C-alpha cells in the first residue's frame, strides 16, 4: 500500500482542494488528515490525487 | 422525600409563569408554531378562547394541551394573597393566583415553581403518580 | 393565487449601502430576504492559501485567516463562476477560482506594511476592494522578513463561512411606531423614536392597531465592498427564488414518485 | 496582535482604518471624532478601533530568525 | 336553540381591585332585567369596554342556530351560519363550578356559575331559575355586543 | 475535533433526499414535509404563504435540532384539497412574489440611479 | 360536635336524605333497621379510630404520609364518571360501608 504517508490532494467532492498526508489506506478508502483543518477525514480513493 | 427530584427550571420556569398569565393571547400562526413542538399533540387545534373580533388562544389552552391525561391538581401561585381564599373571590381569582388543573386542563392560575417544580403534590408529581414515567417524561419535554 | 404584490421604494443608494422600503409583503418574506442578504448571497473570497515563505511575526494560519476576510470585487464575475465542488477540474481552474499571489520582502530599514495592494490577481476584475481609501493591512514586516504565498479565491456564500458574507450591516425594521405592540415598552416615553417614526414629539407610541399585521419593512443594506448593495439585494432575491425553485423541482419528483 | 480585518459583530472592514485612525489621533482629534471621520457609526465597529492594542509593533522589535 | 342565558348588562365597575393585567380588565356588571350579577375578564385590547357601557350578554351552548353541538375543535372554514355573526365579542369556555346557597334541607335560590374562557374567568350569579342550563364541565360560548 | 464541516449546512450528502412526504394518520388530510439541508429561511416563508391559503387548516415548521439541518413542515388542509397541492401552490406564490419583487426592485434601482 | 356533624350519617331527616340519595335508597335507609345499625357501627368505628389518632398524633397535626391520595382519587372518579354534585346519588350507604 503505497498511499500511506504521501501528501494527497482531494480532487472530487465537497473537500475539493484540501491537502493532507494519508494515515491509513484501503483499496477504496483512505484516512487523510487534512492540512487545512484539524481533522482526519475518511475519503473515497477515487477523489484523491497524490502529489 | 416523596417528591420529584427534577422539575421545570430556569428559562422554562420564568417563561411558563409569563406564559400562563391571564392576558397572554396567541394568534393563529403562533399557536401552530407552538403546536409543532408538542410531541403528544393529537393534531386537533383547540377552539380559541376568544373567537371574535379575532381568534386568539390563551397560554392556558396551550398548556392544557401540554398537561397529560386528566390530571386533577390544585396549587397556588407564589403571589397568592393570604386573605383571598377567605374572600368573596375564592373561585374567581382577581390575580390569577390560584392554579386549578381539572381534567388535565389548566382552568386558571399562573404556574411557577410551586406548581411545576420539585415540590410534593406539584403538577409534575401528580402527573408521575397518575400517568407513569413515560407520560411524565413527555410532559417535561413538552413543557420545555 | 394568494401571492403578495410587494412594492419597493429606494430612499438612499450610495456606493456603500442601499436604503429601501418594501410594502405589502409578509414578515416572513421580509425576514427571509434579510437572512439571504447575510447568508445566501455568493461572493468570491480566498479559501486556499499556500504559504511558500512566512518570516513575519504572525503565524501561517493567522495570515491565511486574515487573507480570507479581505473582500474581493465579486460583481459580474461570481454569477458566471462555478462552485469548486461542482467544477470538473482537478484542482482549480479559471471557471471556479481566481488565483492571487503575494510576494513581499522588507529590505528597507523601516517597517513594511503588507497591505491588500500587494495581493496580485490573475483575473483583472476580482481584485481587493480597497485596491480598486486605504488598503487592508495583512501583516507588518521587519527588515529581512518576507511573506510569499499563493492564494485561490473560490465562490461561496455566507452560510458556510462569514468571509463570504457580502454585507456589513443589514438594518431591518418594521412598524417603527409600535402600532402592533410586537414589543411592549414598560415606559414608552423612555424610548427614542426611530428614523422612520411618524409621531410628533408629544406621542410615544402609535395607537394600537388590532387589525394590523407587519406590512411595511425598512432595510438598510450596507455592503462590505464585494458587491454593490443593489447587487446584494438582486442576488438575494434571485437566490431565494432559486432555492424555492429547486425545492419545488424536488417536491414535484417526490409527488410524482409516490 | 494586529488590527482585525472585519468587525467581529457586523463584518465591516476595519483593517484599513487603523493607520488612518492613528493619523487622526496624531492630528489632535478626539477618539470619538476620529471614529466619526472614519465612518464607524455602529458601536460594534467603534470598539474594534477604540479597544485595539497594536501588539505587532512590539513583536517587530525583535530581530527575525533568518 | 341552545341559548343557555340571555340578558342585558351595564358595566358598574372596571377593575375594583386595580388593573392586574395589561390586556385583560375585569368588569363588574349588573343586569337590568333579571337582576343578575356579572364578573367578567375581557380582553380589552381587542375589545375595549368603558365604565357605564351597556352590552347584551348571551351564553350559548353552541354557535349554530340549529342547536347542533360542536366538538370544541377550531374550524375556521365552517360556512354554516353562526350565532357569532351578530356579536362583536365571542369567547369559548368551560363552566367549572356551580356554587349555590343550598343547605342540607332547602334547595338553592341563588346560583353562581363560574366559567373559564381559556383562563379569562366569568362568574354569573343570580336567581336559580336563570342558571338551569349551566352544568359543570359543559362548554359554553359567551357572546356579547355593545348596545347603543 | 468533532467539528462538522461548514458545508453540511446546505449540501446533501450522497443518498440524502431533499424532501420527503409522510402522510401522518393522526388527523385527516395532513402531511409532514421533511426537508433536508434547509433552515428557517425557507421554513418560515413556506409556513406563512401556507397560512395565507384559506384551504389550509394547519401550517407550521420546526427545526428538530439546530445542530442538524432539517426542516419538518406540517400542513393540514380541508378535505377538498391536499397538503401536497398546498405546498406546491405556496411555493409558486412565493416564486411569483419574489419575481415581482425583483422586477420592481430593478425598476426602482434604475429610477434612482438616473434620478 | 364538628366530628359528629361531619361524619355521622343522619338517617332521621328524610327530606335532607332525599337531596343526597335517590328515592329507592332513602326509602331503604328510613325503613331497614339493619342499615341503620350498620351505619351507627360505622360511626362508632370512626370514633375509636379518632381516639387512636388522638393517641398517635398528640400535637393535633393532621398532615400524614400515606400511599393512596384518596381525595385526588375521589376527584378523579368525579371527573371520569361526570358526577354531578347537584343531583341525588344512586350510591347506597351500605354499599360504601
Ligand atoms: Zn474549476
Ligand atoms: Zn461592526
From Swiss-Prot, chain A:
Name the gene that codes for it.
SUPT5H
What does the record say about tissue specificity? Ubiquitously expressed.
Q: How does it assemble?
A: Interacts with SUPT4H1 to form DSIF. DSIF interacts with the positive transcription elongation factor b complex (P-TEFb complex), which is composed of CDK9 and cyclin-T (CCNT1 or CCNT2). DSIF interacts with RNA polymerase II (Pol II); forms DNA and RNA clamps that stabilize Pol II elongation complex while maintaining the nontemplate DNA strand in the transcription bubble and nascent RNA in the exit channel. This interaction is reduced by phosphorylation of the C-terminal domain (CTD) of POLR2A by P-TEFb.
**Where would you find this protein in the cell?**
Nucleus
Q: Could you describe the post-translational modifications of this protein?
A: Methylated by PRMT1/HRMT1L2 and PRMT5/SKB1. Methylation negatively regulates interaction with P-TEFb and RNA polymerase II.
Taxonomic lineage per UniProt? Eukaryota, Metazoa, Chordata, Craniata, Vertebrata
Which start and end residues of the full protein are shown? 703 to 753 of 1087
| Domain KOW: start-end pairs | 2-35
Q: Which residues carry this modification: N6-acetyllysine?
A: 16
Q: Say which species the protein is native to.
A: Homo sapiens (Human)
Covalent S-S links between cysteines: none
Name the job this protein performs: Component of the DRB sensitivity-inducing factor complex (DSIF complex), which regulates mRNA processing and transcription elongation by RNA polymerase II. DSIF positively regulates mRNA capping by stimulating the mRNA guanylyltransferase activity of RNGTT/CAP1A. DSIF also acts cooperatively with the negative elongation factor complex (NELF complex) to enhance transcriptional pausing at sites proximal to the promoter. Transcriptional pausing may facilitate the assembly of an elongation competent RNA polymerase II complex.
For this chain, the family text in UniProt reads: Belongs to the SPT5 family.
State what protein this is by name: Transcription elongation factor SPT5
